Design a protein around this ligand. Structure first.
Ligand SMILES: CN1CCC[C@H]1CCn1cc(C2=C(c3c[nH]c4ccccc34)C(=O)NC2=O)c2ccccc21
Ligand SMILES: *SCCCC(=O)N1CCN(Cc2cccc3ccccc23)CC1
Ligand SMILES: [Cl-]
Ligand SMILES: [Cl-]
Length: 277
């Protein structure tokens, strides 16, 4: 595919990339085109993010994931053609409506779990999962994105990445990520859906790091009991003891948690999501 094939429309967002809403003229398909300046990627020292983003997304084929449909270049630019998620970031919705009812919390948590199971199945660790990175398409189904910081396992691995609010303990104290590290993030995300704020809150990132390793957070009073129960089984310092990790026997037990007991798992992507709170 060539640049000339697209209208480059509204700039959807702008650090070392600009994401534009593009329309392929002949098919009228919309894509989110990520535009990168080769030279600026070099000077900011972000080539690893780009190559890694490409490698990982090229392995993904699942409804709950943004897909990499095409890549092209010209003399000064790199163009990534991605799935366009028209409804933007999960984060926007939590800020907008405050916190989700249990029906919505349950459904979206289910889709994220379903997504993680697939990702981890292919031996990939996201490492930076968060509401900003969980997008909603036109059908209001999730589409995860931002794989630049991901890791392909050969287990565990070594790297220095994350977002303070969702970073797992093991990343901070062993400088190593595993699949269970994503389950920690999931725990933080469920909490935030229900409470309307992330669980670990402090004066700065280092202080946030301290909360995390201290397991220092609180459930407000209105927290759905079964969700509280699930969150406690995910926010566990010992990475080998989180619900859904390999030592805990995997996703079977995670999906069997009472919080999910009503969920119809196999065709989540084909169900009309619940009206958002
Ligand atoms: C740079 N950003 C703006 C705010 C947060 C961050 C966006 C997170 N994000 C959103 C992405 C995507 C999309 C976006 C939809 N609305 C946006 C607004 C700003 C930036 C991106 C998007 C999308 O349609 N498909 C996507 O894959 C995306 C694709 C690759 C890496 C990170 C991404
Ligand atoms: S769109 C087709 C795929 C492009 C692609 O995979 N890559 C790999 C990452 N680089 C690194 C890079 C970036 C900027 C300038 C470069 C000059 C020479 C060699 C690599 C460069 C290229 C695009
Ligand atoms: Cl948005
Ligand atoms: Cl909006």
């Amino acid at each position: 595919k060539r640049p000339e094939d697209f209208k480059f429309g509204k700039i959807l967002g702008e650090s070392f990339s600009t994401v534009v809403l593009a329309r392929e003229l002949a098919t009228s398909r919309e894509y989110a085109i990520k535009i990168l300046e080769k030279r600026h990627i070099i000077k900011e020292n972000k080539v690893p993010y780009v190559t890694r983003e490409r490698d990982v997304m090229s392995r993904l084929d699942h409804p709950f994931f943004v897909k990499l449909y095409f890549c092209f270049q010209d003399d000064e630019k790199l163009y990534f053609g991605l799935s366009y998620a028209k409804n933007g970031e999960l984060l926007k919705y939590i800020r907008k409506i405050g916190s989700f009812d249990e029906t919505c919390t349950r459904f979206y948590t289910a889709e994220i779990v379903s997504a993680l199971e697939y990702l981890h199945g292919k031996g990939i660790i996201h490492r930076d999962l968060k509401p900003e990175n969980i997008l909603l398409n036109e059908d209001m189904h999730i589409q995860i994105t931002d794989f630049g910081t991901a890791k392909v396992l050969s287990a565990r691995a070594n790297s220095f990445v994350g977002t303070a609010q969702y970073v797992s303990p093991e990343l901070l104290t062993e400088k190593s990520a595993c699949k269970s590290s994503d389950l920690w993030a999931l725990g933080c995300i469920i909490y935030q859906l229900v409470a309307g704020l992330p669980p670990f809150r402090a004066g700065n990132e280092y202080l946030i790091f301290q909360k995390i390793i201290k397991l220092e957070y609180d459930f407000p009073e209105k927290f759905f009991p079964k969700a509280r129960d699930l969150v406690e089984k995910l926010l566990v310092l010992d990475a080998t003891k989180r619900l859904g990790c390999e030592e805990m026997e995997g996703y079977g037990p995670l999906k069997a948690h009472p919080f999910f007991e009503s969920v119809t798992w196999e065709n989540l992507h084909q169900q009309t999501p619940p009206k958002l709170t």
